[PDB]
């Protein structure tokens, strides 16, 4: 069955409006995937050790040592917003929907092709491509999620974002266990710290093979493969942001004195002595009821140690932070509430005609005011007693450990039973969409990498690979490296991701932040005279929501 | 499925006679289309600016600046009379039918072929064509008319007019928005006018993609594609012409004195003093009832400014005129009532064995006397009072604006609530058949380009394209230009256009103008000793019709 | 009775939107003054032919 197609290209996003303001978004994405023969046919256990870098005192954070199993299989990952929606669709969703529901996912492989390269070793010399009709492409869909979960978006290795531009999958590899020690130090530290990779703990070894745990399918041109329809189990993702802070929760103080003339100088006045006011407070000493002192239900947001690194059996790792805005606009603390920074290129944004190999990037800065501005933090001695005396105040300025560039905010952590928090907002187009939950007894309240964490079950991973096209000479009983015909494959991938949205309703007199084409962004949405493209990142939760 | 054909060639025109003089014309047209790989795979936004020409004062009309989106898709356009009928059929329709009804349209693509060119780089060197059996031809039929409407007949780019001669489609491209200024001037104008292309208005940008708005079909040799049957909604087109003018409407004056002997000198005489006659007039002053002064119901035809150019956001454009004859035969005013001029060649008429690249052409001159002869126009002062004195007459001779070559007829416009007019007559074989209506709130009473304007709905456009035949080396992450195997395609197109005609009836004693072979046209209808062909244009509405 | 639009181009499209420039044309001031700035309606291309 060579002369018949086995599939259809479809990259349309359908918006189906239902009853009561609910829409059913059907994002169709098709892509032509190009796939090469594995450079090797065996699994390799490789160690990566860049001690040359960590050898330099004060370079701990640049540690890359790990051990990974290198498989002869490739992963077809489509878990990233850019694969399903273009700037247009996205603007539609973000400007009018109030919440998003991830419903189901299904993919299929069709119109498979396998060619053989022949070196017409004459003159230049030449190269001749031919069809190997009876050759097969191997396909394995790990439904049971036996294999380790490895999101390609984490390393900008998902399918590309352009319907009219071929793409490729990524060689699949996964972490193996290993013990590693690396002691912190600074430029002036003495002696040689302790930078040792101890190896692997036998009680943590887990060598996985696809061949042994997932049925594999062989497809020839005539064949096709389709996944079933997987249904997610995730909480809805909101498309609105909160702006309220503790300072803006509840009943404002009653102004006894109101401005009588226009002018951004004419303020209103509470009109009551800060120690002669009524209200509630959690400060049993003073009688000062102040906007920064009065009681509030709980606490929106929280403080966590910044540029903290922790260490365990495998080595050091940065301490993650779940947090939004908190601070002026061109007045951040990227570190404090962890604004994510995305590095990618060409195939996932970055102008296409770009040269060199320096990735493009951006630091996403959410609209939700749930972050913190450390410099504003301070601490006072129980006696209160203002103006506070230097001996009774710890400030983001006073040093810690005699260190000049470290202070309590750095060590600080105000997470507790009163912490109100929100989930990570979606990041177009470089963000991951869904993520598999940790199989720990107690799970995390959220994941920092994706807004959708399928709990009870997630779509399995799809592995692809060109099956061994051997030559007439092959001897198992001789390490050699099995000479095999240079074969490559081309197939089309088609996926269908279904969402369920809820149309928003206005509730204020005033208009609202809406995504829109300007005379400034204009050319970020259209190709140029050479056909170069790029996909600029966009914000998602533009639109306020009352928090309390 | 490679060894089996998927279609049939049919280029027969069937005439099926019904009851009560109605015939059902079924025009079948088949053609072998040749199609090449796109020179580029991306959409390009290109600007065209020939300021070098408009720089020369007095060359405004030669302005070509515009912006267009260049797509990697080709359009298969068959909307032009020459594609469906040969001189014979046409003579039949034009000589015996009185009116034409455009009923339905359907097309289909079959017996698809895709070959690969290989340069046997030896000696001359050689070239080798091979079949790429598993390759696909992409097909997209824009049913919803999402895409911008682009009639290829407008630029002589429809399918060719010979059943036994292969043809090709045209690269599809469409207008993009842009602001442009160009101020009129004459040879002796001083300073440098104002010739500026300002660019595009963001509020008018509309980048269209086929991939994003029309499902695409992949066909391999075994496959085939067929459109459904589309049904038009258009007014009938008449195949007769009117000759009556205001001067010949109604009851002629009664001749009291009739000629008594033969001779084109012996005239009849009304026999009553022009100021002593009875009748109606719209001239409340005089008592002169004259053949050029007596009342008439309304007005056949109208006067409009000639070689008028108007300007708006995009630049200048000639003011269109809807009008027929009006004037002697070798006594026109091509400009005044806008006789169309058609430029084309080889594939759509023009002797086939022709060399060089100067198009062939003709100015169509309709039989309907609905035009005007300006030189005959004049204007008189309210007092009437003849013979009229130079100071009370504006003539097509007196100058306007002190200009010697401009007069009121040039500025003139007599369109009003009494204007009687006819539609554009069909032009064989270079004319467009149907046209999509403007989506403006108020529409035009007619289109100057085709006699059939499908209002509520029109057949969608058919886009074709060779799908990317990549080589073993392809890297998305590198602008390059994706090296791809030189692939081309050959497929057969078959369309069916159904009309409904009405047989005419004689009502006069005298015979009537009929199309016919002469000793002069004879060789315009047959090939020569070399096999050269050409298709000479013909008139359609030869046959009078009483207007009133 | 309205009809929802459908995208048919690769490129985005002119959309009405709040800027750092129009911002205060949509909210009252410290005195309670209001104003309603005119807006355009047919922002969005349509193929004519
Ligand atoms: Ca921040
Ligand atoms: Ca804010
Ligand atoms: Ca004329
Ligand atoms: Ca005539």
User: What is the per-residue DSSP string for B176-209?
Assistant: E--EEEE----TT--S---EEEEE--GGG-B---
What whole-number distance in Å separates Cα of residue B437 and Cα of residue B199?
28
Residue B174: its chain C contacts at CB < 8 A? 47
B540 CB-contact burial (10 Å; exposed 0-12 / middle 13-18 / buried 19+)? buried
Question: B489: closest CA among B48, B230, B133, B207?
Answer: B133
Cβ atoms of residues B80 and B153 within 8 Å: yes
Number of other residues whose CB lies within 10 A of the CB of residue A225 = 20
Cβ atoms of residues A428 and A537 within 8 Å: yes
Q: Return the H-helix or E-strand segment holding A411.
A: helix A408-411
Cβ atoms of residues B27 and B499 within 8 Å: yes
3-state secondary structure (DSSP) of residue B418: coil
Residue C7: its chain A contacts at CB < 8 A? 88-89, 92
**A144 annotated as ligand-binding:** yes
B349: left (phi over 0), alpha (psi -120 to 50) or beta: left
Closest CB to B212 among C10, C40, C48: C10
Q: Return the H-helix or E-strand segment holding A23.
A: strand A22-36
Residue A517: its chain B contacts at CB < 8 A? 202, 205
Q: Which residue of A has its CA nearest to C30?
A: A262
Cβ atoms of residues B394 and B426 within 8 Å: no
Cβ atoms of residues A201 and A177 within 8 Å: yes
The position carrying tokens 């205001």 is B246
CA separation (Å) from B492 to A508, B111, B306?
61, 6, 45
Residue A517: its chain C contacts at CB < 8 A? 12-15
What whole-number distance in Å separates Cα of residue A8 and Cα of residue A25?
20
CA separation (Å) from A18 to A25, A99, A235, A515, B276?
11, 15, 20, 24, 80
Cβ atoms of residues A465 and A73 within 8 Å: yes
Question: B466: closest CA among B73, B62, B79?
Answer: B73
CB pairs B-C closer than 8 Å: 63
What whole-number distance in Å separates Cα of residue B300 and Cα of residue B278?
24
Resolution of this PDB entry, in A? 3.0
CA A370 to centroid of ligand 1, rounded, Å = 9
What whole-number distance in Å separates Cα of residue B320 and Cα of residue B307?
9
Q: Which residue of C has its CA nearest to B201?
A: C14
Whether residues B149 and C11 touch (CB distance < 8 A) is answered with: no
Structure token digits, residue B85: 């009928």
How was this structure determined? It was done by: X-ray
CA A376 to centroid of ligand 1, rounded, Å = 13
CA B536 to centroid of ligand 4, rounded, Å = 22
**Which distant-in-sequence residues (6+ apart) come within 8 Å of B348 by Cβ?**
B80, B82, B156, B158, B160, B161, B429, B430, B535
Structure token digits, residue A82: 């850019």
Q: Return the H-helix or E-strand segment holding A318.
A: strand A315-318
**Residue-by-residue DSSP string for A506-520:** --SSS--------TT
Residue B12 DSSP one-character state:
-
Closest CB to C14 among A95, A259, A517: A517
Closest CB to C45 among B204, B209, B438: B204
Please report all neighbours of A, defined by 3+ CB atom pairs within 8 A: B, C
Residue A514: its chain C contacts at CB < 8 A? 15-18
Q: Which residue of C has its CA nearest to B437?
A: C49
**Which distant-in-sequence residues (6+ apart) come within 8 Å of B318 by Cβ?**
B61, B307, B308, B309
CA separation (Å) from A137 to A35, B28, B219, B286, B472?
10, 45, 22, 97, 16
Closest CB to B44 among A3, A123, A531: A531
Cβ atoms of residues B214 and B142 within 8 Å: yes
Question: B78: closest CA among B347, B426, B346, B432?
Answer: B432
Best of B120, B477, B480, B487 to disrupt the A interface (most A CBs within 10 Å) is B477
Largest Cα–Cα separation, chain B:
99
**Which residues in chain A are followed by a discontinuity, with C-to-N distance exceeding 2.5 angstroms?**
none
Structure token digits, residue B353: 């064995």
A327: left (phi over 0), alpha (psi -120 to 50) or beta: left
Cβ atoms of residues B430 and B360 within 8 Å: no
What whole-number distance in Å separates Cα of residue A438 and Cα of residue A446?
10
Structure token digits, residue B236: 């009938």
What whole-number distance in Å separates Cα of residue C31 and Cα of residue B12?
81
CA separation (Å) from B9 to B15, B491, B496, B501?
19, 12, 12, 25
CA separation (Å) from A402 to A9, A397, B179?
65, 12, 66
**Which distant-in-sequence residues (6+ apart) come within 8 Å of B412 by Cβ?**
B303, B304, B305, B374, B377
CA A322 to centroid of ligand 1, rounded, Å = 11
The position carrying tokens 């273009």 is A86
Whether residues C12 and A263 touch (CB distance < 8 A) is answered with: no
Question: B433: closest CA among B26, B83, B95, B175?
Answer: B83
Return the exposure string of B80-96: e unless at least 16 CB atoms fall within 10 Å of the residue's CB, then b. Answer: bbbbbbbbebbbbbbbb
Structure token digits, residue A459: 């779509």
Question: B423: closest CA among B156, B151, B236, B233?
Answer: B236
CA–centroid distance for A374 within its chain: 25
What whole-number distance in Å separates Cα of residue B176 and Cα of residue A371?
45
The position carrying tokens 């459904």 is B228
Structure token digits, residue A534: 């790029």
Question: B410: closest CA among B547, B529, B307?
Answer: B307
Best of C11, C12, C33 to disrupt the A interface (most A CBs within 10 Å) is C12
CA separation (Å) from B188 to A326, A469, B320?
68, 79, 28
| Residue B380: φ, ψ to 5° | -125, 150
What whole-number distance in Å separates Cα of residue A137 and Cα of residue A134?
10
Whether residues B212 and C6 touch (CB distance < 8 A) is answered with: no
Structure token digits, residue A366: 């959410």
Cβ atoms of residues C35 and C22 within 8 Å: no
Number of other residues whose CB lies within 10 A of the CB of residue A172 = 23
**Residue-by-residue DSSP string for A28-79:** EEEEEEEEEPPS-SS-EEEEE--HHHHTSTT-GGG---EEEEEEEEEE----
HSE of A212 in the Cβ direction (CA atoms, 13 Å)?
5
Which fold, B1-548?
A: Empty Capsid Viral Protein 2 (2.170.30)
Residue C6: its chain B contacts at CB < 8 A? 146, 213
Whether residues C47 and B205 touch (CB distance < 8 A) is answered with: no
């Amino acid at each position: 069955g060579v002369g018949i197609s086995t599939g259809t290209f479809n990259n349309q996003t359908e918006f189906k409006f239902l009853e009561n303001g609910w829409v059913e978004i059907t994002a169709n994405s098709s892509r032509l995937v190009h796939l090469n023969m594995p450079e090797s046919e065996n699994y390799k256990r490789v160690v990566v050790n860049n001690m040359d870098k960590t050898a330099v005192k004060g370079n701990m954070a640049l540690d890359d040592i790990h051990v990974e199993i290198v498989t002869p299989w490739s992963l077809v990952d489509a878990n990233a917003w850019g694969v399903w929606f273009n700037p247009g669709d996205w603007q539609l969703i973000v400007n009018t929907m109030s919440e998003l529901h991830l419903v189901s996912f299904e993919q299929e492989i069709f119109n498979v092709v396998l060619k053989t390269v022949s070196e017409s070793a004459t003159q230049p010399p030449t190269k001749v491509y031919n069809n190997d009709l009876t050759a097969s492409l191997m396909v394995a869909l790990d439904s049971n999620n036996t294999m380790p979960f490895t999101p390609a978006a984490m390393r900008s290795e998902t399918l590309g974002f352009y319907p009219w531009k071929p793409t490729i999958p990524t060689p699949w590899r996964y972490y193996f266990q290993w013990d590693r020690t690396l002691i912190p130090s600074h430029t002036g530290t003495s002696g040689t710290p302790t930078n040792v990779y101890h190896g692997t703990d036998p009680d943590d070894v887990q060598f996985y093979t696809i061949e042994n745990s997932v049925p594999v399918h062989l497809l020839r041109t005539g064949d096709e493969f389709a996944t079933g329809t997987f249904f997610f189990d995730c909480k809805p993702c909101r498309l609105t942001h909160t702006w309220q802070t503790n300072r803006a929760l509840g009943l404002p103080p009653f102004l006894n004195s109101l401005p009588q003339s226009e002018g951004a100088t004419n303020f209103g006045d509470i009109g009551v002595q800060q120690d002669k006011r009524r209200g509630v407070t959690q400060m049993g000493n003073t009688d000062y009821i102040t906007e920064a002192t009065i009681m509030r239900p709980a606490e929106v947001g929280y403080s966590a140690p910044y540029y903290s690194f922790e260490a365990s059996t495998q080595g050091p790792f940065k301490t993650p932070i779940a947090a939004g805005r908190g601070g002026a606009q061109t007045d951040e603390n990227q570190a404090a509430d962890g604004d994510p920074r995305y590095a990618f290129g060409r195939q996932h944004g970055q102008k296409t005609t770009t040269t060199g190999e320096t990735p493009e990037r951006f630091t996403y800065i959410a609209h939700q005011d749930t972050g913190r501005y450390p410099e504003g933090d301070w601490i006072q001695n129980i006696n209160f007693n203002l103006p506070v005396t230097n001996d009774n105040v710890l400030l983001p300025t006073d040093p810690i450990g005699g260190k000049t560039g470290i202070n309590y905010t750095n060590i600080f952590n105000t997470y507790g039973p009163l912490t109100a928090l929100n989930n990570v907002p979606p990041v177009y187009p470089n963000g991951q969409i869904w993520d598999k939950e940790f199989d720990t007894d107690l799970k995390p309240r959220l994941h920092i990498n994706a807004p959708f964490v399928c709990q009870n079950n997630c779509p399995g991973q799809l592995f692809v690979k060109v099956a061994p096209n051997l030559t007439n000479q092959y001897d198992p009983d001789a390490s050699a490296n099995m000479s095999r015909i240079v074969t490559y494959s081309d197939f089309w991938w088609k996926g269908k991701l279904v969402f369920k949205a809820k149309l928003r309703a206005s509730h204020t007199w005033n208009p609202i932040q809406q995504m829109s084409i300007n005379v400034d962004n204009q050319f970020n949405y259209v190709p140029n005279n050479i056909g170069a493209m790029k996909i600029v990142y966009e914000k998602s939760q533009l639109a306020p929501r009352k928090l309390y």
